[PDB]
Amino acid sequence: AVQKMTRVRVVDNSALGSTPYHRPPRCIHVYNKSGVGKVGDQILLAIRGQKKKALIVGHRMPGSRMTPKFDSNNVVLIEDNGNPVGTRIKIPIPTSLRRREGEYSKVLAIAQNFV
Amino acid sequence: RFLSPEFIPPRGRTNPLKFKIERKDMLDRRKVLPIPEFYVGSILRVTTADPYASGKTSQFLGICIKRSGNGLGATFTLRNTIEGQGVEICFELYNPRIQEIQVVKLEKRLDDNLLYLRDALPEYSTFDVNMKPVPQEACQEVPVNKLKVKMKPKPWSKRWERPNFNIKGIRFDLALTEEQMKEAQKWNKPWIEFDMMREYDTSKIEAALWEEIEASK
Amino acid sequence: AAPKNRRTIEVNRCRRRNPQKLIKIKNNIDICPECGHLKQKHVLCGYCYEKVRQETTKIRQQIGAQEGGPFRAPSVETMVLYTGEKPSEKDQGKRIVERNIKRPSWFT
Amino acid sequence: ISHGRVYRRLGLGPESRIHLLRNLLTGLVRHERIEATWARADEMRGYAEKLIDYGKLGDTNERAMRMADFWLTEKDLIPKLFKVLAPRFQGQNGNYTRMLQIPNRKEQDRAKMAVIEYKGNYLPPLPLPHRDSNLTLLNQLLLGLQQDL
Amino acid sequence: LHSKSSTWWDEHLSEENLSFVKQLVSDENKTQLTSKLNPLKDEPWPLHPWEPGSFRVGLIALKLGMMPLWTKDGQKHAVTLLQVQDCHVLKYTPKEDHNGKIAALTVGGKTVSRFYKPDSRLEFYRDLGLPPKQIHKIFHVTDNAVIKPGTPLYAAHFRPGQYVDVTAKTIGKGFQMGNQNRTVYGLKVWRVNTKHNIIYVNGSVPGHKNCLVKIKDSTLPAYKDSCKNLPFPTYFPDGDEEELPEDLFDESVWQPSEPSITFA
Numbered sequence: 058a059v060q061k062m063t064r065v066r067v068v069d070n071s072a073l074g075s076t077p078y079h080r081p082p083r084c085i086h087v088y089n090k091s092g093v094g095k096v097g098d099q100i101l102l103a104i105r106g107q108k109k110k111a112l113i114v115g116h117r118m119p120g121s122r123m124t125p126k127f128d129s130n131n132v133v134l135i136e137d138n139g140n141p142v143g144t145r146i147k148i149p150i151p152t153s154l155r156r157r158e159g160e161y162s163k164v165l166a167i168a169q170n171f172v
Numbered sequence: 173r174f175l176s177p178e179f180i181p182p183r184g185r186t187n188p189l190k191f192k193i194e195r196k197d198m199l200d201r202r203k204v205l206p207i208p209e210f211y212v213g214s215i216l217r218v219t220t221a222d223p224y225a226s227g228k229t230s231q232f233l234g235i236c237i238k239r240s241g242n243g244l245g246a247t248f249t250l251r252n253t254i255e256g257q258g259v260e261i262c263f264e265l266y267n268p269r270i271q272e273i274q275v276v277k278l279e280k281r282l283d284d285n286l287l288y289l290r291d292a293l294p295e296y297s298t299f300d301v302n303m304k305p306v307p308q309e310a311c312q313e314v315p316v317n318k319l320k321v322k323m324k325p326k327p328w329s330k331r332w333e334r335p336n337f338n339i340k341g342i343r344f345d346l347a348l349t350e351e352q353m354k355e356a357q358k359w360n361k362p363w364i365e366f367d368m369m370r371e372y373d374t375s376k377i378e379a380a381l382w383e384e385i386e387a388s389k
Numbered sequence: 390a391a392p393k394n395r396r397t398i399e400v401n402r403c404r405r406r407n408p409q410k411l412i413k414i415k416n417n418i419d420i421c422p423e424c425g426h427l428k429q430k431h432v433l434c435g436y437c438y439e440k441v442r443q444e445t446t447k448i449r450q451q452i453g454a455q456e457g458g459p460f461r462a463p464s465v466e467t468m469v470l471y472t473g474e475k476p477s478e479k480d481q482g483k484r485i486v487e488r489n490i491k492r493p494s495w496f497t
Numbered sequence: 498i499s500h501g502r503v504y505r506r507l508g509l510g511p512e513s514r515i516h517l518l519r520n521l522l523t524g525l526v527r528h529e530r531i532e533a534t535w536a537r538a539d540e541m542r543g544y545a546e547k548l549i550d551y552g553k554l555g556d557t558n559e560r561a562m563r564m565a566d567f568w569l570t571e572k573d574l575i576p577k578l579f580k581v582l583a584p585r586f587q588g589q590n591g592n593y594t595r596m597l598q599i600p601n602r603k604e605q606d607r608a609k610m611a612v613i614e615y616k617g618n619y620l621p622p623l624p625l626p627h628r629d630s631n632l633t634l635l636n637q638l639l640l641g642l643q644q645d646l
Numbered sequence: 647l648h649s650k651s652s653t654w655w656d657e658h659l660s661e662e663n664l665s666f667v668k669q670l671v672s673d674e675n676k677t678q679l680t681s682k683l684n685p686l687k688d689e690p691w692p693l694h695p696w697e698p699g700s701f702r703v704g705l706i707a708l709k710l711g712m713m714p715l716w717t718k719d720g721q722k723h724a725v726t727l728l729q730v731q732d733c734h735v736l737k738y739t740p741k742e743d744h745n746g747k748i749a750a751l752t753v754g755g756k757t758v759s760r761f762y763k764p765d766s767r768l769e770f771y772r773d774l775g776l777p778p779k780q781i782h783k784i785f786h787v788t789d790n791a792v793i794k795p796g797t798p799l800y801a802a803h804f805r806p807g808q809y810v811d812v813t814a815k816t817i818g819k820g821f822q823m824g825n826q827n828r829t830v831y832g833l834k835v836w837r838v839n840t841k842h843n844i845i846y847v848n849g850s851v852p853g854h855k856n857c858l859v860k861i862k863d864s865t866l867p868a869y870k871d872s873c874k875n876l877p878f879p880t881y882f883p884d885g886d887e888e889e890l891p892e893d894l895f896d897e898s899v900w901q902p903s904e905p906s907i908t909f910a
């Protein structure tokens with residue numbers, strides 16, 4: 058449940074995300090009709106004093122049965138053109154994104170680890 | 173005689189006939205799929221059909237941390253750390269899409285719930301997914317792990333120090349002073365240990381269930 | 390806020406004499422066969438209960454004197470005996486309370 | 498709003514209710530017949546029945562000893578429960594306590610009064626209600642029906 | 647005093663007679679129910695064929711509870727349990743005497759005790775030959791579908807795969823509410839148990855558990871004519887043309903004891 062605020066971890070090799078910064082990246086909205094952000098929901102993440110779109114891949118909110126509950130909030134950066142900002146993803150990514158409605162093939166291709 | 177938790181019905185005004193019908197269906201499914209005996213703290217490997225994948229099964233290994241639900245809707249959760257990420261998956265015992273259930277290591281832990289392991293060190297929660305089954309003795313009690321886990325800094329998900337939780341597997345002394353325990357003990361509610369209004373007797377029910385389960389076999 | 394005008398007795402009389410505000414009669418009155426006094430169907434007799442309660446105090450008073458001290462509750466069964474009644478073999482190993490009065494007819 | 502409630506609110510708190518119930522239970526055991534408010538008497542009736550079961554369980558039971566000590570403030574009663582109350586009720590499987598309605602107190606508050614006692618006691622029998630005899634005309638008419646059937 | 651006194655059925659009944667009274671009531675209820683078991687053998691009213699626009703009678707059921715259900719696709723659907731108890735036709739109302747648009751039929755279920763009921767209610771039921779029922783409800787039924795009073799109704803009237811509408815009183819929340827009749831539409835039926843007359847209905851039903859509910863065919867435009875392939879007047883166990891299975895399942899429903907579902 059990526060609600061307002063909700064400090065998050067940038068799982069990407071993008072220069073902004075990869076470079077350490079003293080302020081954590083924050084998520085204070087979601088690209089959805091509802092205000093709550095879950096796995097597969099686009100967001101906009103303020104990183105290194107810049108705003109970049111990111112895709113949620115994990116959350117710490119309890120999930121439905123038969124699904125794994127993550128302990129950290131993980132996101133993947135996506136460019137305006139639609140291609141991922143980063144060329145690789147480190148943290149395991151759930152495979153449910155494929156069937157989820159939306160364009161997730163590009164992100165999944167960049168995901169090395171699947172759980 | 174190990175009576176699985178789901179067979180025991182919960183108190184209420186629901187007709188007992190529903191449980192009898194539910195048990196019959198549960199017993200029939202048990203013939204199709206064998207449900208091994210396990211307890212919280214045991215490491216299990218469960219085979220389930222993958223909906224996203226086509227004709228490919230999934231096996232997840234983790235220590236059993238919680239048992240919940242009754243009847244056909246009973247579910248169990250097993251926890252593990254994969255790629256350094258703690259993950260908990262809830263499996264419904266009678267779901268048709270669970271192909272097989274394997275108890276890799278049958279054992280018990282100090283507490284009936286292991287949610288505090290999230291606050292414990294990762295090593296206590298890390299388990300090899302590919303670990304082979306360990307020898308077990310059928311006509312014996314499951315091994316009881318008495319190791320006390322070490323906690324992370326004071327901010328925790330729940331106030332395990334409080335007497336109500338009554339966690340016996342936490343090294344509170346290392347992370348909490350005796351004075352801090354006394355503050356937690358302020359919520360003792362000692363009459364609760366002696367309160368007969370919160371006690372539910374299922375001795376007769378448990379005994380009756382055993383014959384019914386065996387009779388179907 | 391104070392009343393804008395005095396309330397008339399006629400208006401007041403109707404309010405207090407409305408059936409909802411009147412005292413209702415009771416049909417659950419019963420007679421006590423034992424004492425012949427009145428009682429309610431769901432209420433016990435009191436004239437006979439007066440004998441029972443007072444007799445209990447008299448029995449209890451005898452018990453208190455026999456014990457002679459606090460925290461002296463026996464660990465064995467107790468029995469009450471009245472004048473003209475002699476302990477039986479079954480009464481052995483039981484606290485015996487002796488009452489000067491004869492066995493009451495109601496008490497058995 | 499008292500829908501689905503299974504516990505009465507008595508005393509100044511939950512602990513007071515236990516202590517007040519504890520005091521009532523201790524008094525009832527000592528005397529075996531106590532008069533109290535109907536609401537309180539009904540609440541404590543269940544506790545008394547369970548106590549007899551603890552006595553039946555056996556003296557050597559550690560839980561019973563702890564339970565008996567806590568509930569009974571006067572320690573002379575602890576032998577009595579295992580050696581007086583428990584032996585008496587061995588044949589009985591339940592219904593150890595008898596509770597009946599008493600006329601309301603004429604103390605200007607009109608509280609509902611009831612008497613709770615332990616069955617099989619040596620105290621004088623309470624004035625229990627007696628059912629109508631079969632010799633009554635209606636019962637005799639039913640007796641004729643029974644004979645025909 | 648020559649005044650009215652409060653009385654109850656047990657006031658003048660002796661213990662020996664009281665036990666006999668309890669046994670007699672059970673015997674009387676059993677005898678009455680058995681006598682009404684065979685409607686077709688009780689001068690049944692003429693049977694008419696189905697035609698478009700016909701409306702069948704509904705049933706009254708008790709809310710047993712809810713349980714989870716799995717389908718052959720692996721999806722889990724929560725379902726509610728409804729039990730039809732002692733469902734019998736009581737009073738038929740002619741079309742003219744009730745409403746020119748359609749006739750109505752009164753159906754009652756869940757037999758109740760006779761000790762604390764008015765004499766008028768007992769008198770009506772004595773004529774009908776059945777024990778009193780907890781609730782009386784009125785169902786709009788076309789003339790062709792009219793059924794003679796006293797006909798037993800069973801859960802087999804509905805069939806798996808049919809959508810149904812259930813209406814029941816909402817739970818009362820006290821002064822703040824509730825205790826008002828409400829209806830839920832578009833609930834599918836997954837399975838029916840013939841032995842216990844239990845119908846499995848998709849979704850939730852308003853009201854508390856053990857509460858009587860009214861069951862009638864779905865009135866949505868899509869399901870305008872679903873009775874053509876169902877028992878048109880009703881299902882008659884008396885006919886026994888072909889004994890139905892004890893448990894009826896929908897095709898999509900995954901039956902217990904079936905092989906584990908693999909998403910191949």
Ligand SMILES: [Zn+2]
Binds near residue numbers: 421423426436437
């Ligand atoms: Zn009297």
